[PDB]
Ligand binder design. Structure first.
Ligand code: NA
Ligand code: NA
Lengths: 16, 16, 16, 16, 16, 16, 16, 16
């Protein structure tokens, strides 16, 4: 799986 | 799932 | 300095 | 400053 | 598992 | 689980 | 400088 | 500046 960084500042870290 | 930062400094990095 | 997580999910990672 | 992620997967992590 | 970084700058973060 | 840092510098980031 | 993980669980992420 | 990941497994995190 990847660690993904969704970003605006703020970031959301996801495991996909 | 998210990586969540539970924080006091120190932090717990939780996989949820 | 240390990395300061301001958590709301989303987080801001500050260099404090 | 804060950690600024530039996301494309690949990411560039910077200190802004 | 552990976090495996593939570095090129850009990096891919994976869970191995 | 949480991210467990085994630090020696170098670190191993385990998903515990 | 390094990012250093001072660790107990919780961790302090230090910029040195 | 960048956060850089030198990697062997172990990783070294640098601020450049
Ligand atoms: Na890309
Ligand atoms: Na590249």
């Amino acid at each position: 799986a990847y660690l993904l960084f969704y970003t605006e500042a703020k970031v959301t870290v996801t495991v996909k």
